[PDB]
Amino acid sequence: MQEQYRPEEIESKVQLHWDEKRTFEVTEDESKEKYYCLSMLPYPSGRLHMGHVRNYTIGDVIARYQRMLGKNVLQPIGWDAFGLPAEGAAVKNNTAPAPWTYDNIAYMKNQLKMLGFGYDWSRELATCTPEYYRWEQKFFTELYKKGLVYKKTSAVNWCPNDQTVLANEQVIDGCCWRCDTKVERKEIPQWFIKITAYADELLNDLDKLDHWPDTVKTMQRNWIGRSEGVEITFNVNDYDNTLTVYTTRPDAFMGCTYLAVAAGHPLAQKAAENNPELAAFIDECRNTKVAEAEMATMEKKGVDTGFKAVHPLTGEEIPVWAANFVLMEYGTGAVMAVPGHDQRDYEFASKYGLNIKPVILAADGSEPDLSQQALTEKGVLFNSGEFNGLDHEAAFNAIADKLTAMGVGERKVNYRLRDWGVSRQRYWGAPIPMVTLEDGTVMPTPDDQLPVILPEDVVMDGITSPIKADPEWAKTTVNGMPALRETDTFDTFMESSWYYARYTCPQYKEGMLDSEAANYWLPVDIYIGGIEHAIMHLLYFRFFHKLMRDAGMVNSDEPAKQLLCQGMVLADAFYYVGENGERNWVSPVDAIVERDEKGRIVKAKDAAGHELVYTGMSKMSKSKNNGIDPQVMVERYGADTVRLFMMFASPADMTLEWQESGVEGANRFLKRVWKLVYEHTAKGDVAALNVDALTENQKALRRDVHKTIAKVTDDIGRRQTFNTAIAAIMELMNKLAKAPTDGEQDRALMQEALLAVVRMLNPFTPHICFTLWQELKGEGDIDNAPWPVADEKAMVEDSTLVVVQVNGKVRAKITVPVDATEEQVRERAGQEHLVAKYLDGVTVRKVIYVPGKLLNLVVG
RNA sequence: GCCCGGAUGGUGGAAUCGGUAGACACAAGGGAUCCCUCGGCGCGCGCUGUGCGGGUUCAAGUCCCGCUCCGGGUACCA
Ligand SMILES: CC(C)C[C@H](N)C(=O)NS(=O)(=O)OC[C@H]1O[C@@H](n2cnc3c(N)ncnc32)[C@H](O)[C@@H]1O
Ligand SMILES: CC(C)C[C@H](N)C(=O)N[C@@H]1[C@H](O)[C@@H](CO)O[C@H]1n1cnc2c(N)ncnc21
Ligand SMILES: [Zn+2]
């Protein structure tokens, strides 16, 4: 051990020890108690960023902590390799997406090894390899034969000049990011998986997930959006078909003055042949991007179709209107608009001058004033024929039962949740195992012809996929006849839905899962990911677990016991307009900035000489080009210093605006720990610690040692507040510096403390603590060492602080015995001059007393 | 727009069940790697202070109602 702390010599040497000895390689050991510490696998974009390092340090801190308790901890790492950014990068850099991805896997693997995350590298997966995606292709064909898969048409962003399907990210300002030509909706046939079949199970089992956070669970409820209502069919005068609409408020059905309809609905298509104005409005609605954000933000417009739907109860002819705000996907592509008691319909009715009929009385029991706004609340009915006087309960059921008796309506459970559309029409993805025969019949790819291997070695023009462009690739022979297999590929969420299960048996050749191995590890004890994946991924992840359960693969109903959704790591994001309107995103490192007096950014110029558009703070990513590479800080300060800084700066769940300020405290702290152990070990081996033969300062120091162990254990294990745990050890270390190491009992006590501190820091800074553990003559490696347990008799308090208050303001503070009555606390508090100052010439009205904590005195 | 969260000294943050506001660090100034000072306004004291406006309470950063700004998701970014 040198006097100076030099990471570059220590860290890589300890990293080699873990690889050669295979410290974090684990098997299904029935003797040890199991623990699955899963962190969400990354997309190999190129470099790591401080978002990644936060996620994986949190996981590694938990994984090393649970090992030291004495459990067989599985912390796996893999690569969610398929994706869009590979194709964009491959075309620009003149490569194929496969070798580009494998380079980025190789680079980031070495960056993860540098950071020293104790992963099981024998279980390493890559989702782009056919050894992985063969099983999901086999799984997909089974789901089709169960009837959970079905084909239907779906809206897609389509640049008509290129003849290519764009993503939501690839559209910007309602325009194509490559070329100058506007995007439009194209209805295209695609494969869907019935996630709505498991909607009630996904909704109900949130109540059993008590160790998941209410933030994530509440978002998933609202996303699913279960809804009990009524379907109501209408007749339309000069129109051969009928219009069904969904509604949760059939009580207000008598106030339905019109019917709003979506743009692509066949009634609007039929009306637009004759009507020239509606033809212009439908073609305007083609420009509407496939996104709910842009749908609600844009102005609510509409056109009268010409048709008149007959209202079943009243018998009145009401106008059917085409409108943008009505979604095609939710409901049935049409609604019963009650503008009197719906703020969205009120504005539509007031704009285009439609009738606003009131049918619900206000809470006072009177006719509501609908001059400024609609009455959204529920109440008694009026001006509603036979249904007058009924409250919401009776009004709902009476009109439902009437419409059920008439045979023009029925009760139905609806979900906001749509089915999982898995068809993508890009190259870099697992191909869908479906075959179109020469017959015309569509059936699954046979088991002998699985997997449908995606050819890695290809050349991409950028417009069209090579497997689509080449006519030879699609050819096959099924059931003794020519056939064309599906050139569309899976959604990338498909691969990341079941990877957690595959980690348990990743080299299992004989099936999708080795259930003996899977049921040992599963379910997952802690799942560490970003808050971004609260809904989309986690809902698929849960859904896919339930499918594997229903195929007899896994025991549990839920995949993960505990969820730790960490907050995003934010960074500044800049860009400039290119010559062909191309958004070239510039990094914060390259941006030259002039700031505001408050703190905000005002001007922004890149190194070359372009006026940068400052978008704002946003999540670190390859897309916005705002990720900060840890490699620079790791080289300078060391992985331990970077790792400690990430955990110390902010609590896991809260978001973090990134800045390097604060690292120097983490660096200096680790030098102080190194220094104190150097000074301690230099004096030689210590005496055996006599517990009941210490001074009061030694007893108080030992109290703080075991109290820190109690706090650090609680803060990590129960709370996951790592910032408070690391701060608690800094307090103890600051106290241990001032402690005099003269006598043998002082050094005996300094041994116990330093053994505890090095073990408590180990999950955060494992490289430095591996070295310090050996230097203190600890048994074996620190990785396998037992986690320190706090002694109850050491933490005993004889006295306690009591804060004296006068009208809720602190005037004095006093030390009192723990078993002291309220009379003794008042008499003791009265002796303080600042307390006696505000009690002269006034009557004590009330005396509140929190036992051994606080004493307020209300004064008159 | 809708759903979910956040805002505390120059800066990141602490206060775990309504009960000492600013632990622990950074940056800054001053002294000799170590020590001192450090929310604001006028002292070994007094008032005030947790984005903004009301309310409940003996007591609110914490609970309630109404805003402002900022982030995440919004179904083809992963
Ligand atoms: C299961 C699967 C669908 C996961 C998917 N393959 C994936 O997300 N891959 S990844 O490379 O983008 O990220 C890996 C982990 O890191 C988190 N993360 C990402 N960006 C940030 C950020 N700016 N700040 C904080 N965390 C971030 C992210 O949530 C995830 O847990
Ligand atoms: C008195 C009000 C509530 C009547 C309103 N015109 C309506 O029927 N709203 C529908 C349902 O009450 C509710 C179901 O959650 O959402 C409305 N709705 C149904 N389908 C759609 C759709 N496709 N687009 C927009 N809103 C819709
Ligand atoms: Zn284009």
CA A9/CA A445 separation, integer angstroms:
55
Q: How many whole angstroms separate alpha carbon A223 and alpha carbon A783?
A: 42
Residue A611: which residues within 8 A CB-CB, separation 6 or more? Answer: A576, A604, A605
The closest residue, in CA terms, to atom 22 on ligand 1 is A51
Indicate the residue type of A397: N
Q: In the numeric block, which tokens belong to residue A311?
A: 């209202």
A771 CA → B33 C1’, Å: 23
Q: Helices A722-738 & A663-681, crossing angle to 10 degrees? A: 40
Q: Judge if A168 and A133 occupy the same domain.
A: yes
- Residues A778 and A761: their CA atoms lie apart, in Å, by 15
H or E segment and range at residue A816: strand A810-817
Q: How many helices (H) and strands (E) does chain A have?
A: 26, 31
Q: State the DSSP string of A654-716.
A: S-EE--STTHHHHHHHHHHHHHHHHHHHTT-PPPP--TTS--HHHHHHHHHHHHHHHHHHHII
Which amino acid is located at A214 in the chain?
D
Q: Which of A39, A52, A491 has most ligand 1 atoms within 8 Å of its beta carbon, as the pocket-test mutant?
A: A52
Distance A246 CA to ligand 2 centre (A): 7
A334 and A483 part of one domain? no
Hey, what are A333's tokens?
């592509």
Residues 6+ apart with CB under 8 A from A588: A571, A572, A573, A574, A626, A628
Other beta carbons within 10 Å of A643: 28
**Which residues are paired to A415 by β-bridges?**
A226
**Among A195, A167, A194, which Cα is nearest to A183's?**
A167
CA distance A335 to A241: 16
Expressed in angstroms and rounded, the spacing between residue A93 Cα and the centre of ligand 3 is 20
The separation between CA A84 and the C-alpha centre of its own chain, rounded to angstroms, equals 20
DSSP A360: B
Point out the ligand 1 atom lying closest to the alpha carbon of residue A43.
11
What b/e readout covers A35-56, taking b as 16+ CB neighbours within 10 angstroms?
bbbbbbbbbbbbbbbbbbbbbb
A417 with A223: CB under 8 angstroms?
yes
Q: Are residues A210 and A348 in the same domain?
A: no
Same domain for A752 and A709: yes
Coil, helix or strand for A196? helix
A579 token code pair: 């010559």
Does one domain contain both A16 and A142?
yes
Q: What residue owns the CA closest to ligand 2's atom 8?
A: A247
Q: Which nucleotide is nearest to A834 (CA to C1')?
A: B45
Sign of CA dihedral A8, A13, A19, A24: negative
Between the CA of A328 and the centroid of ligand 3 the distance, in Å, is 25
- Which residue minimizes the CA distance to atom 21 of ligand 1? A51
Secondary structure class of A436 (helix, strand, coil) = strand
Rounded-to-integer distance, Cα A591 and Cα A291, Å: 31
Neighbours of A246 (CB within 10 A): 18
A768/A674 Cα distance (integer angstroms): 8
CA of A388 to C1' of B50 (A): 53
What's the rounded Cα separation, in Å, for the pair A231 and A253? 12
Q: Which two tokens stand for residue A483?
A: 């056939």
Compute the distance from residue A160 Cα to the ligand 3 centre, in Å: 7
Q: What is the 3-state secondary structure (H, E, C) of A220-261?
A: HHHHHCEEEEEEEEEEECCCCCEEEEEECCCCCHHHCCEEEE
| Angstrom distance (rounded) from CA A54 to CA A568 | 9
Give the three-state DSSP class for A333.
Answer: coil
Considering the domain architecture, whether residues A715 and A845 belong to the same structural domain is answered as no
A428, two tokens: 């870099």
How many of the other CB atoms lie within 10 Å of CB of A109?
Answer: 16
DSSP 8-state secondary structure symbol assigned to residue A718: I
Angle at A452 between CA A457 and CA A554, to 5 degrees: 125
End position of a domain, from candidates A366, A388, A414: A414
Does A245 lie in the same domain as A207?
no
Do A307 and A355 lie in one domain? The reply is: yes
- Of A777, A797, A817, which residue sits at a domain end? A797
Q: In angstroms, how far is CA A770 from the centroid of its own chain?
A: 33
Q: What is the distance in angstroms measured between the alpha-carbon CA of A215 and the sugar C1' of B69?
A: 22
Instruction: Report which residue type is found at A593.
Output: V
Q: How big is the CA angle at A659 (ends A653 and A661), to the nearest 5 degrees?
A: 110
Q: Which residue has the tokens 């210490």?
A: A694
Residue A152 annotated in ligand binding: no
Contact A148, A197 (CB under 8 A): yes
Q: Which protein residue's Cα is closest to nucleotide B19 at C1'?
A: A854
Taking alpha carbons only, the member of A695, A774, A798 closest to residue A742 is A695
CA dist A226 and A771 (Å) reads: 56
Closest residue by Cα to atom 7, ligand 2, is: A247
Phi then psi for residue A157, to 5 deg, are -75, 125
Q: How far is the CA of A574 from the C1' of B9 (A)?
A: 30
Beta bridge partners of A815: A801
Q: Residues enclosing ligand 2, CB less than 6 A? A: A 227, 246-249, 252, 326-327, 330-331, 335-338, 341-342, 345
Any idea which residue has 């959704």 for tokens?
Answer: A565
Are A68 and A785 within 8 A, CB to CB?
yes
DSSP code of residue A777: T
Tokens of A584: 């070239």
Please give the resolution of this entry in Å, rounded to 1 decimal: 3.1
Q: A103 and A165 in one domain?
A: yes
Tell me the C-alpha to C-alpha distance, in Å, between residue A30 and each of A195, A520, A594.
35, 8, 61
Token pair 């801190």 in the structure block, residue = A61
A845 is in which domain, residue-wise? 798-860
N residues, chain A: 860
Looking at ligand 1, which residue's alpha carbon is closest to its atom 27?
A51
Separation between Cα atoms, residue A758 and residue A681, nearest integer Å: 13
The answer for residues whose C-beta is within 8 angstroms of residue A819's C-beta and 6 or more apart is: none
Q: Which residue, of A571, A598, A630, is where some domain finishes?
A: A571
Structure tokens at A495: 């691969």
Report the amino acid identity of residue A667. Answer: N
Q: How many domains does chain A have?
A: 5
CB count in 10 Å sphere of residue A813: 12
How far apart, in whole angstroms, are the C-alpha atoms of residue A400 and residue A244?
Answer: 14
Crossing angle of helices A266-274 and A276-285, in 10° steps, is 140
The DSSP output letter for A381 is B
Task: Identify whether residues A656 and A736 lie together within a single domain.
Answer: yes
A692 and A743 assigned to the same domain:
yes
Q: A409 and A419, same structural domain?
A: no
Q: Letter for the amino acid at A535? A: I
Whose structure tokens read 């307090």? A731
Helix A97-115 to helix A639-649 angle, to the nearest 10 degrees?
90
CA of A266 to the centre of ligand 3 (A): 29
By C1' distance from the Cα of A292, the closest nucleotide is B74
Quote the CA–CA distance of A154 and A187 in Å, as a whole number.
Answer: 5
- Summarize chain A as % helix, strand, coil (round to 5): 40, 20, 40
**Nearest nt to the A215 alpha carbon by C1':** B4
Beta strand pairing call for A844-850 and A601-606: unpaired
